[PDB]
């Protein structure tokens, strides 16, 4: 139960001029062991979350030069010294450490007017409420039983942000989340290496679409970062 700070959720800038935001935590991140998992992503409207950055100051590959994570004890922040095109989107910050995880209720950042590997995941499921589904996720460019990797889930709700779900393991060790009432219960087809995720009993405020995220090796801290074109849910 680890609540990460909003931040300041609004964010118009023009172009070239310098930008920040901030990640503030409720309790100590700092996880047994002595590592603090914190990453950022970004959301363009159109597509799948896409990490920014891996262990706090550390920052992901193909990611441009300009990043800072900042983040120090409870307090976070990412700086971003020239704006450009691309750069525009949705900031969310996320903790990969104590328990059940979570992001911020992320930033919008939006220009001020004026003057290989893949994962596939299953088709669109509309169902009447009270029923039970089972979506896919199929990996490929790597193995899923190597060391240090697993698959976790993650579920985006329009309108009340970003919300984590459930996680396996390489080792097959699956955690779930506890808001979910254990209703959830992963599967995995090792042989075609697909990842299935069952929910049971829907209701209206499971409707939402779901995305599949791999935690990556060691060498990534255990950070999404690849993920799934996500699936979409639908009650009647």
């Known amino acids: 139960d680890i609540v990460m700070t909003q931040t300041p959720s609004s964010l118009p800038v023009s172009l070239g001029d310098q930008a920040s935001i901030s990640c503030r935590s409720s309790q100590s991140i700092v996880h047994s062991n002595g590592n603090t998992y914190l990453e950022w992503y970004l959301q363009k409207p159109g597509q799948s979350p896409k990490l920014l950055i891996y262990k706090v100051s550390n920052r992901f590959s193909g990611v441009p030069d300009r990043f800072s994570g900042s983040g120090s004890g409870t307090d976070f922040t990412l700086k971003i010294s020239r704006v450009e095109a691309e750069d525009l989107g949705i900031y969310y910050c996320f903790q990969g450490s104590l328990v059940p995880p979570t992001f911020g209720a992320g930033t919008k950042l939006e220009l001020k007017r004026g003057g290989q590997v893949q994962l596939q995941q299953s088709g669109p499921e509309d169902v009447k409420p009270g029923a039970s589904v089972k979506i896919s996720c199929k990996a490929s460019?790597?193995?899923?039983?190597?060391?240090?990797?697993?698959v976790n889930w993650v579920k985006q709700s329009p309108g009340k942000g970003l919300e984590w779900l459930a996680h396996?393991?390489?080792?097959?060790?699956?955690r779930y989340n506890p808001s979910l009432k254990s209703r959830a219960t992963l599967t995995v087809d090792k042989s075609s290496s697909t990842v299935y995720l069952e929910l049971r009993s829907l209701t209206s405020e499971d409707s939402s679409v779901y995305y599949c995220?791999?935690?990556?090796?060691?060498?990534?801290?255990?950070?999404?970062?690849?993920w799934g074109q996500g699936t979409t849910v639908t009650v009647s």
């Open positions: 995220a791999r935690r990556g090796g060691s060498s990534h801290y255990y950070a999404m970062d690849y």
């Open positions: 396996i393991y390489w080792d097959d060790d699956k």
């Open positions: 460019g790597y193995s899923l039983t190597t060391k240090g990797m697993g």
